[PDB]
């Protein structure tokens, strides 16, 4: 039981060995394609590639690759594409995805700035009088509106092939108070964030899997995804104890490395994951108190 689990962690303060212990679990399968010569310029971190098994090809007979994977959740029926902050020479292929997977929604991390560096190319419209339109993929991008809140902004952008002509709504979620290697402000925070993706549509299964996203696409991302997936798995069963965090964490990383770089950020995924219960649970009022604790407005 998660709960207990983490009052024994939190008292013995071995955060830090668990986390290790699952780093030393985690599988390991080839990345030969990442790894590829004529790819190296379609990586942001030399170190952070997709396994070959899991990978996301793009439909294109040129060069099918992209820094992405996809995290099927079999048992908990959800899926997940995983991605690095796309490149300055990977924004078309980054919307190429979107449109070839039918995904709905996408859910940046990161800041396209952090730490005096550039953790990722501004691949979105910021003004809807300036369309992006990405050549190389036939793709046209178009800021529709925004919801911008405190610590995260919602667009609505319209992403048309113009190939095809055919138009669809993306939903942009933008979380931009986390820090690379850090954890949300609070439990309240993140749940007001997961619970605004999740009204959207964006996570449902008419669609096809939402784009997650932070700089490497494994760290913020592995959280948010660990997080869902917890409580989608005690959702199903209204049963809170039948949900293994550190099992789940270990299968989500059989499609992609690395999810969830620090002993703090599983910490974090604890304590959303218990908070999240009492929603899941019948306490629909916790919503609107994690609303007012995020200070949003
Ligand atoms: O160069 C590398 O080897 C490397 C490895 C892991 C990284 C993880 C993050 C993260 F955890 F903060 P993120 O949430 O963006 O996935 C950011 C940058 C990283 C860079």
Redesign the pocket.
Known sequence: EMEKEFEQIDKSGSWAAIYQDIRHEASDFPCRVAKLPKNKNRNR????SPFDHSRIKLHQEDNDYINASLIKMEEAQRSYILTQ?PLPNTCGHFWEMVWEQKSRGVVM??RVMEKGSL?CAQYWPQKEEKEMIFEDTNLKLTLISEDIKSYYTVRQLELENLTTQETREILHFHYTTWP??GVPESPASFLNFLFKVRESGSLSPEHGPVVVH?????????TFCLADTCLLLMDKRKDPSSVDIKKVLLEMRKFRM?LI?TADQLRFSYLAVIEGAKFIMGDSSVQDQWKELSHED
């Open positions: 971190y030399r170190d952070v902050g991390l990161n953790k690379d290697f932070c700089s490497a696409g494994i760290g913020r991302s592995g690395g770089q």
